[PDB]
Paper text:
The calcium calmodulin protein kinase II (CaMKII) is a multi-subunit ring assembly with a central hub formed by the association domains. The AD hub, which evolved from bacterial dimeric enzymes, extends the β sheet to form lateral contact interfaces (LCs) needed for ring assembly, while the ancient dimer contact was preserved as the vertical contact interface (VC) in the mirror-symmetric two-stack hub. Linkers with variable length and sequence between isoforms and developmental splice variants, connect each AD with a peripheral kinase domain (KD). Here, we present near-atomic resolution cryogenic electron microscopy (cryo-EM) structures revealing that hubs from the α and β isoforms, either standalone or within an β holoenzyme, coexist as 12 and 14 subunit assemblies.
In order to determine activation-independent effects, we engineered a CaMKIIβ holoenzyme construct with alanine substitutions at both activation (T287) and inhibitory (T306.T307) phosphorylation sites, the βT287.306-307A holoenzyme. The T287A substitution blocks activation and aids R attachment to the KD core, while the T306-307A substitutions countered the dissociation reported for human α hubs by the addition of R peptides phosphorylated at these sites. We obtained three cryo-EM reconstructions from the engineered β holoenzyme sample: a 14-mer (3.0 Å resolution), a 12-mer open ring (3.5 Å resolution), and a close 12-mer (8.4 Å resolution). We were only able to resolve the hubs in these structures, indicating that Venus-tagged KDs, separated from the ADs by the flexible 93-residue linker, are not aligned. The 14-mer hub structures from the β holoenzyme and the isolated β hub superimposed with an RMSD of 0.52 Å. Structures of the KD were not visualized in our holoenzyme structures, given the long β KD–AD linker. In addition, while the KD does affect holoenzyme stability, it does not switch the hub stoichiometry as speculated.
Numbering used by the authors:
A (entry chain L), B (entry chain F), C (entry chain G), D (entry chain K), E (entry chain A), F (entry chain J), ...: 408 to 542
Amino acid sequence: KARKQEIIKTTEQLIEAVNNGDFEAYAKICDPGLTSFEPEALGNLVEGMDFHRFYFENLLAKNSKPIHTTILNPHVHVIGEDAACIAYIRLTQYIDGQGRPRTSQSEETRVWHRPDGKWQNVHFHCSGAPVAPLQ
Amino acid sequence: KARKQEIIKTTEQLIEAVNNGDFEAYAKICDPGLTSFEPEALGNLVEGMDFHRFYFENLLAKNSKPIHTTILNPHVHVIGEDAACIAYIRLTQYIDGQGRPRTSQSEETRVWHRPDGKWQNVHFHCSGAPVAPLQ
Amino acid sequence: KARKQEIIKTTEQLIEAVNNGDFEAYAKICDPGLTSFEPEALGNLVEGMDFHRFYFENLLAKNSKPIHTTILNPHVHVIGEDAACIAYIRLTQYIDGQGRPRTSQSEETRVWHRPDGKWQNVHFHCSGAPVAPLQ
Amino acid sequence: KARKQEIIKTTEQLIEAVNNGDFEAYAKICDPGLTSFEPEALGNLVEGMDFHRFYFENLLAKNSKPIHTTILNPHVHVIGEDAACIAYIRLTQYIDGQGRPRTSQSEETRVWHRPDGKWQNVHFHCSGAPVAPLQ
Amino acid sequence: KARKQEIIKTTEQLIEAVNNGDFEAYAKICDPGLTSFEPEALGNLVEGMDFHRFYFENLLAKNSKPIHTTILNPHVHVIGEDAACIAYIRLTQYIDGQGRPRTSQSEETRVWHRPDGKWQNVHFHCSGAPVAPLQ
Amino acid sequence: KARKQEIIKTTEQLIEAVNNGDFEAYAKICDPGLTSFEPEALGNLVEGMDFHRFYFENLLAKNSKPIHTTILNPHVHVIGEDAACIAYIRLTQYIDGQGRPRTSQSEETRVWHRPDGKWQNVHFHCSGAPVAPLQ
Amino acid sequence: KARKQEIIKTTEQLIEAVNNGDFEAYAKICDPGLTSFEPEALGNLVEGMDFHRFYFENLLAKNSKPIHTTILNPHVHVIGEDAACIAYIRLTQYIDGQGRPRTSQSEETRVWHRPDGKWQNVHFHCSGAPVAPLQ
Amino acid sequence: KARKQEIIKTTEQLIEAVNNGDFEAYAKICDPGLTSFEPEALGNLVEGMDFHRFYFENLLAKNSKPIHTTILNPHVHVIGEDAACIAYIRLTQYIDGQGRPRTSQSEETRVWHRPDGKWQNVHFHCSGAPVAPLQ
Amino acid sequence: KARKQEIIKTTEQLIEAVNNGDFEAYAKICDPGLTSFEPEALGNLVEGMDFHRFYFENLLAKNSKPIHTTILNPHVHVIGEDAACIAYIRLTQYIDGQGRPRTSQSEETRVWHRPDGKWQNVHFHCSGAPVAPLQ
Amino acid sequence: KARKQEIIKTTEQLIEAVNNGDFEAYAKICDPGLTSFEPEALGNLVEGMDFHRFYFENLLAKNSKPIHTTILNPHVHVIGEDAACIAYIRLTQYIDGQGRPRTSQSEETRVWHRPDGKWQNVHFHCSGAPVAPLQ
Amino acid sequence: KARKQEIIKTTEQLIEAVNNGDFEAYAKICDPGLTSFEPEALGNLVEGMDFHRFYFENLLAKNSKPIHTTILNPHVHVIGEDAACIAYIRLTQYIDGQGRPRTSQSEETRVWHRPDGKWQNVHFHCSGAPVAPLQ
Amino acid sequence: KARKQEIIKTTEQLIEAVNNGDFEAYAKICDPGLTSFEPEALGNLVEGMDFHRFYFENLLAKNSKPIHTTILNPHVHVIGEDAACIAYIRLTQYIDGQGRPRTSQSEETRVWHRPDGKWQNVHFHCSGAPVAPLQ
Amino acid sequence: KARKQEIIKTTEQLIEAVNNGDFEAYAKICDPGLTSFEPEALGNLVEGMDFHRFYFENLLAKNSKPIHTTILNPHVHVIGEDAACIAYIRLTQYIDGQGRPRTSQSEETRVWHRPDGKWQNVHFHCSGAPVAPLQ
Amino acid sequence: KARKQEIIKTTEQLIEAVNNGDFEAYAKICDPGLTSFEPEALGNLVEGMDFHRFYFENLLAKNSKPIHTTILNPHVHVIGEDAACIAYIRLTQYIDGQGRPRTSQSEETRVWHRPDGKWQNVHFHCSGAPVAPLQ
């Protein structure tokens, strides 16, 4: 019961890092063999870090607008001593180029494993909106 | 290396069962606590079997058209003695109501665990097209 | 903790009655001073039973199609010995006039009171789709 | 008969606070376990204060335009010594970015309980327009 | 206080007569100098009975479909011993040519006078939908 | 015959006051229990003065453009010693934001009563265009 | 004052003849040098009877549908012992090819002269709809 | 034969006055009981001078652009010693806001009477374009 | 003055022949070196009879519908003992494939010469609609 | 054979004059009783010079752009000692308001007579584009 | 001068053969090394007979509708004892699937050479419509 | 075999001259009796040099943008000692008004003759795009 | 030079087999490790025979319509004793469901290798239209 | 197995050169007889270097924006000692003129041969997007 809390804590940390534009921080939580389905891949299965490094260097760098993220009804499956899965709904509140409020939704899955006594994210599937807020 | 083959074999079996409209068969491979993201849920996270039982009783029952399914570039992560994850691209070839050929694509993730010495599917995330071919 | 279960049980019963087209049954669970916000009222606050009696006599009577209803993440507030409130999301699966599957969503609130030792529904607010499935 | 007046008085106070952009004031009238259905949640059931805190910090702060709000035909149910429900129609008059007059309508439900001898709002369902005037 | 009830009673009777297609009955309640604003006049002020006699002879005659009419929040002004005014909102529920339910709204004013000890309708203004249900 | 002239005279005075933006003047001619149907109410029946006070404070204040109003074919019913009704068509000529001429039409009903030996307007129904010229 | 009545009587007779499809009757009331502006002339000024004779032989012949015509607010100028002018608005109620009611408006001028002690129509200008009801 | 010339001469004079923006001149040629059908009246029959006085004070005042008017195929009926009617087609050439040439057509009727030994225009019907050139 | 009448008479005869579908008759009135501008030539200048012979053999042959043709304001120039030109406007009334009346306009020029003591048409220019009625 | 050359020479001269904006020159070649069909007349037959004088005073005056005109396949009929007709196709090359090249086509007829030993143009019919290049 | 006639004669013969659907005849007039630009080639340069043989076997075979072809203003260049070129405009009149007349235009070039004392067509360029009439 | 090379060489030279805006050079290679089909003629067959001289004086003069032209798969027929024909596809690469690259295609035929021992172009047919690059 | 002929011969044979619906024949010419880019794969790289086997069993089986295929300008590279590449343009002529002719274009590459002394196709890239004719 | 690595290495080098705008470098890796299918050729098969030289001189020269290219799932066939083929999917990430991120996909084939002991690219087929990123 206590193990579900630390998956949600770790997941929160990861999302924080991304919104902060901290590539250094992000690289410590992801497995170096990470794979992902996301809208920016145009239906392709991407693998490794360097496809993502572009957005941390050229988009997230300029992040100045106020933002808020809410995680709704997380379901955690624990499937060994060192293995976990989480499914959740994500709401992001942001302000657009007109100065008006906006909200966008994505539905998301992450898979976790614990090599060397540290949790690492090995896979990610993002659906509905992209990871960055929709336009 | 040999453990990746049996995940792909088991995944194939599951997809076969669905196309066949065999609810009995389908219920043996899924965990009774299965959860899923799929377009038919309208962005909601559904849990348990009875949301799916409707399509096996009222749609799949009438399945008469010829169909072919191809799995492209499956990536398998093995994350314990009894835990596995698979990501893949799915192409379905089918014939429409005009009698013309059609093809549709979905991109898909499944998570697997082995309680009682049998593999069970615990989570599913489907993206692009629905599980049944698009119109 | 046990009182939340009987609100969800009673709410289920009410929804059953409506789908069944049982006006007799429906009249026993509702307060005779019931009020409602629903799309069929065109933004107006209707009160009493006879606005609803039309659909039980002229629409629900003919109900023949297969249907399934799922209640997602019900939140119950208990606010006295004899007073309760419930908020929930409703998914309805149905088959259309072409013979194709459909799903529709509504988000809903009900308020309950217990005069004479029996639960009665005193107010209802329906949002998104109407009470009957959308077209 | 006298208890219906103090529900309408309290409801008026709450709406005043929101239009004024007074988060401090707003937090005293709402229950800390408040839940709401509103268009900004995109069909989701939100809970707690911090989803709302964003608009008091980033939108309502800048409120400068003249505004008027009218409550039409409030119906109050009183359902214990310490429990009440109110349904009402809301008209808001405002001036747009062109300097022209506008009016918008919402239809609304609030549920009230009296712990510690003070009325607290425990649930809210907003329909038609959002809480802030429509564009 | 009692005089407001008999205006609402008389108004109900008139609406009944129209839906029934009873021209004989309708002619007894209206003043022979009746005037009206209604959508069928195309923005013109019509006077006397023979413009209306057409619909009782050629449309209302064929009235076979089920119908229900609800009067919402009637306001009555009494302005002498023998003079009254009523404003109200009207909801009509009907079934269309596809066999589907429909609802339409009109907002309406009637003026009443009592020559020879019998109430007579002297003016009518109809707005939103026409007197017969909208298509 | 002479009593029809003073209703038309009084009605003219009222319309003058509105176009002039004289709230003080307007308040003396209307009954404090005035009710109205007008397009700005969005199909609702408004009552009392403060819904109208907004336009005298924020729109009519700025009235600078040339305007002309013509009343066509007024019909007056006199229904006691102290009670009257008037129906009329209104044409307004105005100049738009391009500097081009425009004309708009509304069709209108007013009801009058004479408490304390002074005529007061008790009800108003406006149809076609709003009270202010259309855009 | 009495001479205005016989112009309206004569005008009524003419309109009757046209709706009846009586070319014989129509030819007795019109001057043989009649001229007209009407939509069927496509902006041209037609003169004499034979342009009109086509519609009495090929359209009006088949006239079977129920019809009603109302003349609103006729203004008559009398301009000698034997000379008159009339301006009026015409409403026609008719039933369309779907079996639904319709109404159309035209605004019309006729000029009259009395050679040989009988009134004759010398000119006609028709505007808005054509002489026959609009589609 | 000679009397047809002076009607065309007088008609020319009137049109000149209007294009010149000479309200003084215009008032001498029209009967004080003039009536008209024109597009600016929105299908209504206007009477007297003050509806027209607006355009001489606020539009025609600014008339600066070059203009030319041509009268085509005038037909004159003479119907007493002191009574006449004229029907004609009018072409107006003008330059638009882009500096490009434009032409517009109207088809027109005027009725004339001679009280006190001076011709006066008693009625006017304008069709196609308005009196001022079309945009 | 008398020579203008015989040009209009001859022109009438020609138009009669065409509507009648009489190629024999048509060939006697036209010069064998006839040239024409008409919409059927697609902006080309056609010469001789055989381009026209197609419509007399394959379209005009089937002419069964009622038709009427009116010639408006013919202008004739006579330019020798044996040479003439005519310009005119043509209105055709016809019944369409729905059984509804229609009217179409063309504007037309013909040139005439008298070799061997018989008038012959040497050129034709047709504008607006084609020679046969428009669809 | 030689007489066809002088018609084409004279026609060229006329077109030159128009493009040059020389009203003086143009008036010497046209008959004072000239008539024309042209698009600027809106389907009407204009007669005399003053309708054309407008374009020489207000459009052609400003002619500054480069222009070229080509006459294609002129057909000349000679129909007396002093009477001629010409049909031709006209291509005009011009530069538009963007500075891009444009070409437009018209198809044209002119009729010529020789009073007092000088050729004069008595009629003109222009089709496709107007006389000035199309936009 | 006489050699231009036999090119036009030979060209006529070829077009006859095509419309007749005579592949045998067509093959005798074309060079076996014929090349062509035509719309059916989709912008490609086709060479030899077998691309054309398809339409003689599967389209032209069924040719039943009446057709007429006119050749306008042929220009012939003769460029040796045995070499010629022709440019021309082609009008085709035909009847469509509704039974209505149609006309289509193409502009065309053919090149001719005389090996073995017989004229042969060596190249063809077709522009505007295809060789068969347009739809 | 060697004669095909000098036709392609000469054709290249001509295209060079046009792109260079060298009218002097262009006039030496073309026959003074040149004819052409090109889109700028609007479906007409133009003859002689002066229609083309306009573009060398008013468009090609300003040619400043970079351009490249490629000739694909030229087919040459040689049809005497002094007579030749060439068919080819032309690709032009250019930069537009936004500064973006563009490519356009035309398909083209030229006919050549050798009077006085120098090759001269006698005919040209251009299809798809115009001679200058498309917009 | 002779080796280019046998590649074109072999390529022709393959295309024949496909149009014939001969899966047996097709399997002998392709390498069992064949890969392809084609529109039916939806941008994916397919490998092996069984994706293609569907169309030979369910589409090509029913092939009844007349068809013709033309190969334009094949370029062959020979790159060893046993290795070759071919690029070509393909035109297909076919008849549609209306019975009208159609043509479609694809541009295509094939790669060939000679194991065991027999040519085998190892790769295919198809662009523009699909392998079967476009709709 | 080792030979597949050097094809992928060489292919990477080529793509690098293109993005860098290094024409010198690009010319060393391509065969001087290179052929290509690419969208810029408009369906044509181009051959040699000078069609490509335009983009290295006029587009790639200005390349300043950040860019990233990813090669997905390369398949290599090796078909001799000196002959190879590669098929791959290409994703390009770039920033647009608004400063927003973009991604585009192409699917691509290259053929390689080793004359003189150096690998040279002999053919290229590009599909989906062009070689430069899509707009």
